[PDB]
Amino acid sequence: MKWAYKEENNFEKRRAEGDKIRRKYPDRIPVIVEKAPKSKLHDLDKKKYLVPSDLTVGQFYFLIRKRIQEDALFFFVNNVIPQTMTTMGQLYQDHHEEDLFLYIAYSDES
């Protein structure tokens, strides 16, 4: 999967922003959210989120679903589906990339 955010911004640009966000938002987790390319679901135009580190994956599903519009929704992070009760702070620690961002893909199929 290629991420529009990464096609638009090279590593220098992403890491510079990740450095700044981590300094100014210690309490929050930066997340880039994009649709798996072959999913029939609606594509998300607003893809950059700063979420409380104590928010859980399941709370994030609820908020993202609210922006995506009978269909199943699954998150993939580094090719695994996270547990809904995991906090976004823990998910970030385990899954963030070296630009200091967390990338979550979503699809209608497991």
Binding site: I21, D27, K46, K47, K48, Y49, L50, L63
Partner: peptide
């Protein structure tokens, strides 16, 4: 586009 604070403090 602009980063989006999601959910209140």
């Amino acid at each position: 586009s602009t980063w989006e604070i999601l959910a209140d403090d």
